[PDB]
Every structure is written in C-alpha cells, then in structure tokens.
Amino acid sequence: MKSIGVVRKVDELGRIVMPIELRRALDIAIKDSIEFFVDGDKIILKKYKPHGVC
Amino acid sequence: MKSIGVVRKVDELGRIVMPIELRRALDIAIKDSIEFFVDGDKIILKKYKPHGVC
Numbered sequence: 001m002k003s004i005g006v007v008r009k010v011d012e013l014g015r016i017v018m019p020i021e022l023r024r025a026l027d028i029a030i031k032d033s034i035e036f037f038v039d040g041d042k043i044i045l046k047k048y049k050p051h052g053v054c
Numbered sequence: 055m056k057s058i059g060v061v062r063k064v065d066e067l068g069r070i071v072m073p074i075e076l077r078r079a080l081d082i083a084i085k086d087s088i089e090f091f092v093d094g095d096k097i098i099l100k101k102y103k104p105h106g107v108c
Contacts, residue, residue, distance in 0.1 A: 002108045004097075007089035010072065010082050017069040022090070022097045028064050034097075035061030036073070041104065043058075043076045045090070045097035052096065054056040 018045070026050065072099070080104070 008016035018034065026034065026047035037044035037054065046052050062070035072088065080101035082088065087102035100106050 002089055002091040002098075004090045004092050007087045007102045009085040009087060010077060012084050013071060014073055014077055014082070015069060015071040016088055017067065018064065018097070019068055019090070021092060023064065023068055025092050025095050025097060028068070030066055031063035033061050033063060034070055035056055036058045036076070036099075037056040038058050038075060038079050041079050041100060042106070043072070043079060043088075043099035044056075045099060046095065048061045050095065 004021055033048035034045050035048050058075055064070055088099050089102050091098040
C-alpha cells in the first residue's frame, strides 16, 4: 500500500498497467510518454516533455 | 534520456512496458510485483516484498 497503493504484476516481458493517476500525475492522454529513472532499487516514472531530474 | 533513458507510450488505458532493468533493479522474474508511489507529478515503482517508503 502506498500513495497509489496499487501493485502490478509484470506480464512476462515487463509490461504492466500504469494507473490513470499516473496519466493524471504527468500528462498522459492515451499514450503520451513515460520515461523512467532508476534509483538504487526503485524506478522513477515521469513524462518526457516536462523536463525533470535526469 | 535518464538513468534507464527509456520512455514508453501508454497503450490506451495506462498499460506500458517496464524494462528488464526494472525487474533487475527490484526483484521481478516474470510477474512478481511492482507497487507505485506518486510524488508531485512523478511515479515511484518498487517491489511489494521490500517495504520502502509508503
């Protein structure tokens, strides 16, 4: 349980379902963009257009 | 372009493809578990078993 409190299960490759809350968080309309940043063990998802830490 | 440097496009609902590097960062084999935490505009993914910040 977290802020979103949702855990996903990798398909088989690594594909999972990100929440509308992620689409809402960033800017995602139907595909838009989500680029990830790895931190220690964790993964950081953010849209491409909004330049953040990289 | 970031640590992983990979950006995804949502399918339609919110599903995208997370990298092997995510399975490797955490501890995902084929499905395992990835729970996300939303922070400001961004999303924070980590395995369920290892209880980090929540």
